[model samples]
Target chain A: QTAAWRKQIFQQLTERTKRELENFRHYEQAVE
Target chain B: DDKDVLRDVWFGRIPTCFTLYQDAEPYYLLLPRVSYLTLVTDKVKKHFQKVMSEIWFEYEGTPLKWHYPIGLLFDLLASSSALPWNITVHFKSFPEKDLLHCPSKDAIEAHFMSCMKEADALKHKSQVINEMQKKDHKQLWMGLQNDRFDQFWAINRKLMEYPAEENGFRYIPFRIYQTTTERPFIQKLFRPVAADGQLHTLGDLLKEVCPSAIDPEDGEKKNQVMIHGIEPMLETPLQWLSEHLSYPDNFLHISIIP
Candidate 1:
């Protein structure tokens, strides 16, 4: 259960960061 | 001040009108101004359910991060000093960081001024308009004001076609109409976007868009467009100030200035 929880947590983290970057192109374009 | 309001919220009861843009329906949620940003984010989360699995909070056009106290953010930015702090909930994460990733309020009271305008629009049964048989003079403007993003496009996509003389695009808030120079007839219509973003002059705006608007000749002439009830041309960005003027669907109504 502990190992499964750890895997699930990391999986969510990775997915979220991935999602955040999808519009990363706009990040540079967003002027102040 | 929409008549459809329920009660209020805890954090100083800002009475903010937030929206789930992904929905076909609409809402004006009374939110808290002094509460934790997470609370607002969480409430929005519940409102959208799983489909709102991920999210981004959009103010005007800027994207907000998940942290920061919501009220503080509005307090710093909004100058309207009223209620129905209009916010848009974009149903996905954002990539822009601190791009005006700044703290934000003011409701833009008479909150749903356009909701009534939207209601004015909802008065119509069909999407088609016949100016030849036009009833209410303003009915011509309804398609731009009352329709949702998709519905607005579904009706008219010509807004992008510029030399855009006669078309009405209500979706873009803060319109600059040449109320003075044209005198008996207001000719120019512009939506000011500061090139430098720090300060854009109303005079410059006039010269650029107005059919024959002249550039600012001097001090007083350089300053036009009364904002916050006075000319803000030289010192303010209409983009930033438009937030405080009314509801999110609001416009500067820069009809007369200088």
Candidate 2:
């Protein structure tokens, strides 16, 4: 993929990744 | 200062445009001093020299000739002189506050030494390329018919003939013109080389043709044309500075003391 297209996809993925990572971290820590 | 003086130097200066070729295209080389210098220092000064030297060495002595690489050397010098602290002092005065603490002399020297290491490495690479170029040239001249070398030259000629347009967002090409005579000869020589598709290094091409083919005088003339073309855009900045800043221009004059 071109840099422009990769950048666009990365932008979209970044938001979801941040949210999912935060949720997973929260869930993992809840048992501890 | 008289507005006339400002107009004559800053506004009325010759345009900085260049006609790339006959029957090709023209473009203005608009160099906004601060931004342009910053870019040169950070990218071209810091990195491009190594690449350029590598290319030069690759072609050593051939049909694609290499010049002294004087411009690159000059740019490296200018970049060194414009170290961050020196650059800051030019625009900002230390009248009200203590001067910024200078970096430790040893540290500064060490940093400069490291830069020299990088530069030396690049120079070494260039030497290696030159050795290879000599060997290649000997082979080619001695009867090795390298079609790829011809292709590389053709690509370069094509680039000259039909200059690539910059990505259309930031700056528009201005003063576009071409001469037919320039186009024909270049295209004729270029096309066969292009068809050969020989894999040749940048140095190989430069060794065949003279680097610094564009004389500095011609470069200056091109810059003048470009400056003229962009003068209109600069008018607003000049006007703002003139109206906002108050300084008696005639108060200071140069005089030789006996």
Candidate 3:
């Protein structure tokens, strides 16, 4: 059960990287 | 759920207005929820031409500690207030009994790095962070300092991982902060998965450590368990929270407020 969930979670996190990075870059520039 | 939750958390901000106890003009800025007060307010002091050998802050007469993250403090003290959180700056009469003196930004950096080590100790027995080089460590700090989420997570995700065979980290690192408690905060060893192979939820952790944190079933609200300025569901999984909702230090900094 745990192994299956970890596989799913890690895959989601890996896919999240691109958009998350772009969002943060825009946020930092706006706040600055 | 959309993993955009990670980006939302990393970019959390609070609009704030800082005024010296006797300032002629209030300084306004969007304060990062995850950053410390002293780490981001150098300009606030300079704006007032205001100075302090020992600077401090207060909200409704309570001394704000420099070590606590700004959002945690805000949620505990001013969550009910109107927008543009108001904080009073003080240059004299440092609350020696109430707060630790944060003399420089390096002090903030030191405190932050120590928290990472402590959290890693609980999660992986310090194996992950210990394997990192000095530059890798500095990379983490510099990324946070510069507000570069991509740079920080490039290194931080390693610390968030566990062995392939395990359900979660060896232990979940969490700290519960509350005003009513005599202790400053509660820190203890808790596993994400119980011995019976049950996944522990946020409610499970609170029931073990701070039962009062869970609201009474048939009464008006008395307390709130806030992480990052919002109340998370009690049913949320602790392992999931530890992975995605923790501060940059890798510990879930929870605030309990009445």
User: What digit string (tens of lDDT, one per residue) describes model 2 on residues B1-258?
Assistant: 233332222211111222211112222222221111221122222333342211111111111111111112112222223211111101122222212222243332333233323322232322322334444423322221121224322221211121134211111111111211112111011111222443322122222332222234432112111111121211122212222111111000011111
Ranking by DockQ: 3, 1, 2
Could you arrange the candidates by lDDT from highest to lowest? 3, 1, 2
lDDT string, candidate 1, B25-68, tens digits: 33344333323333344455565665531456666766543332
DockQ of 2: 0.01
Off by over 4 Å in 1: A1-32, B1-11, B50-53, B96-258
* TM-scores for the candidates: 0.28, 0.15, 0.84
Q: What docking tier does model 2 reach?
A: incorrect
TM-score of 2: 0.15
lDDT of 1 at B228: 22
What is the TM-score (0 to 1) of chain A in model 2?
0.39
Q: Pick the candidate with the highest TM-score.
A: 3
Candidates in order have lDDT scores of 0.36, 0.21, 0.77
Q: Who is ahead in DockQ, 2 or 3? A: 3
iRMS values for every prediction: 21.5, 26.5, 7.4
Two-chain DockQ for each candidate model: 0.02, 0.01, 0.07
Model 1: CAPRI class: incorrect
In terms of lDDT, which candidate is strongest? Answer: 3
| Residue B80 in candidate 1, Cα distance off native in Å | 1.7
